Assembly symmetry: C3
Homo-oligomer: 173 residues x 3
């Protein structure tokens, strides 16, 4: 399968052209920097409407054939932050270890790391992971979870991905 | 705009007879010691009857206007410990980070911390957090989660709370 | 005077039709024999990755064999057929999130893919059920991390008395 990665930015201010999406860009830069195998990116910037979040994740995995989807934004305690809810709504199997580890590494930086509801799950042969907002916080989580992503994708029948062992080691037991 | 904090002691010995409440005392002492802003306390000692627990929490959040509710008791593996279930039932959004951190910081001193099912969640503009029962554990847990509570309450539109930075630094934002 | 019975279930489509040596199952039974100092019996089962069969097996061991602890190994990854957590959630009335969190945490040290494990733990009557990993190295760190709380958990749910060799692993039992 051709490796396709989705990057979804859930932001009203970004979807309005009001501001630059430093979050999504950070994710795309990260992927380009560490991956050494051929892949394409399906980038989407949408408003924080659970309706549109669920449909976007479904289109990317079902129609665009993404084997991995990385979201950014809408994962805090505020009532409008429904990215986790939308992810649960489209996945058939969740992965608690992802949220646990991401909050773990984020705690070293800020105590409010515990307010994050970021999670991850599976839909068919696609893995969906909720990332943080700040470009430097996204790097921290990615460095922590990327090591297990390519292998997870292998286990769910997704496309082959491999990374620069000098930037991030894709662990494969 | 008034800050009201609920403290609910859930007892597994309402039948055996309660001769003290060191758990409630530990919580009340902590709030008084670290909070520098004006606040009132709605205190409740109730037997561990699921329906009553839910009713009590709803009353405190909806009628008494609490922005924060702290519970102690009924969070172990025994069948009668249903505080977590009751909390889940009245909240619209859960915060996995709280239970994770509380179990993590309590592990070194309490190997059986992994038996605790404490969680935390949101009901409107009120944050509800389950605490352990041992006074020493209550302090350790509150020291770990209080830093993010005031801000979490801001995000859900609750009352303003601030703590003595020389005791506990309420991170904002 | 409740008798202590411990279930050990190796879940695998592969091994279900034959396995020269159940390394994972043996590691677990070896561990129990080494650390436990109180009398106890083992109920061992090898079944395929079939949700309904896993549920029935756990139910049989807890309800019929009177197990106070059931340890499973296998079927806890992200793959479609890995349904041990699903089966476990289905037969338990109360889950213990602390187990899964701690096990992945200790497993993560040598295996970055530990975050893909969906292992959990729950209570069915007076029996505690814990999902362990398949790798011997992971099995050891998980047991070293959770066994200290197992005996006490069993006490709290009305199960059989189990005590471990404090020299290997101390069974933490707080008082009041």
């Amino acid at each position: 399968k051709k490796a396709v990665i989705g990057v979804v930015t859930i932001s009203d201010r970004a979807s309005k052209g009001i501001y630059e999406d430093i979050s999504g860009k950070a994710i795309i830069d990260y992927l380009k920097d560490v991956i050494i195998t051929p892949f394409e990116v399906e980038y989407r910037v949408i408003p924080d409407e659970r309706d549109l979040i669920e449909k976007t994740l479904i289109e990317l995995a079902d129609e665009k054939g993404c084997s991995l989807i990385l979201t950014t934004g809408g994962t805090g305690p505020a009532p409008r932050d429904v990215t986790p809810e939308a992810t649960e709504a489209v996945c058939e199997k969740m992965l608690p270890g992802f949220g646990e580890l991401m909050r773990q590494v984020s705690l070293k930086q800020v105590p409010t790391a515990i307010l994050s509801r970021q999670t991850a799950g599976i839909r068919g042969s696609c893995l969906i992971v909720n990332l943080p907002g700040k470009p430097q916080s996204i790097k921290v989580c990615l460095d922590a979870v990327m090591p297990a992503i390519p292998y997870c994708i292998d286990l769910i029948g997704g496309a082959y991905i491999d990374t620069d062992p000098n930037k991030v080691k894709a662990f494969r037991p």
